[PDB]
Automatic annotation (TrEMBL):
UniProt keyword Magnesium present: yes
Catalysed reactions, as listed in the record: (R)-4'-phosphopantetheine + ATP + H(+) = 3'-dephospho-CoA + diphosphate
UniProt-annotated binding residues for L-ascorbate 2: N17, T144, V147
GO CC annotations on file: cytoplasm
EC class (word): transferase
Record key words, sorted: ATP-binding, Coenzyme A biosynthesis, Cytoplasm, Magnesium, Nucleotide-binding, Nucleotidyltransferase, Transferase
Protein name (database record): Phosphopantetheine adenylyltransferase
Encoding gene per record: coaD
Task performed by this protein: Reversibly transfers an adenylyl group from ATP to 4'-phosphopantetheine, yielding dephospho-CoA (dPCoA) and pyrophosphate.
Length: 163
């Protein structure tokens, strides 16, 4: 018996009730879960790295075995650095599936010890994308059903600072 450490990479911009569901579910079949926020150094996200990790920690803080780190670089190197068992990914949109199968088969060429595991979210979380959430918030639309309160207020305070 070893001790399992799954990495859950994402821009998490912002974290969604979807992401929360998956991380809870992962937290039950793995010893450590690392919520790994991509800095996206050349990607251009809406929430600062600090904003994102905050909203993450706010929503999943109460889970003993969940850690939160930022990271940039190849996900493969981050994987090796973290002596990770496997990389956690969620499946729901079919176009999802073909890229996930590609990023999984490709990273494995880079590091043979590389592993993806996949979860499906609750049918109530399957339609939620960070991107759709941004665009609904962006147009002064209610996202309380789709993201944690933390994030609701956080949108209200990009609106207070303009937007
Ligand atoms: C794919 C990258 C960009 C981040 O993933 P993504 O942009 O999809 O992030 P997102 O914030 O949406 O969350 C990530 C994960 O959560 C899942 N997810 C998002 N919303 C939901 C939801 N409502 N329900 C279930 N799962 C969900 C996604 O399908 C994904 O598996 C990430 O792997 C990365 O930045 N990699 C580093 C760059 C790299 O090395 N690239 C080439 C070699 S890997
Ligand atoms: Cl909530």
């Amino acid at each position: 018996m070893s001790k399992t450490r799954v990495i859950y990479p994402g821009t998490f911009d912002p974290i969604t009730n979807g992401h929360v569901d998956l991380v809870t579910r992962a937290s039950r079949m793995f010893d450590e879960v690392v919520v790994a926020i991509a800095i996206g150094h050349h990607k251009n996200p809406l929430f600062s790295l600090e904003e994102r990790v905050a909203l993450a920690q706010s929503s999943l803080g109460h889970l003993s075995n969940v850690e939160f780190v930022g990271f940039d670089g190849l996900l493969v190197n981050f994987f090796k650095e973290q002596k990770a068992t496997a990389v956690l990914r969620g499946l729901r949109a079919v176009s999802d599936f073909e890229y996930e199968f590609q990023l999984a088969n490709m990273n494995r060429q880079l590091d043979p010890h590389f592993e993806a595991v996949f979860l499906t979210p609750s049918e109530q979380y399957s339609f939620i994308s960070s991107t759709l959430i941004r665009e609904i918030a962006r147009l002064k639309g209610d996202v309380t059903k789709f993201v944690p309160q933390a994030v609701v207020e956080a949108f209200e305070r990009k609106h207070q600072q303009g937007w």
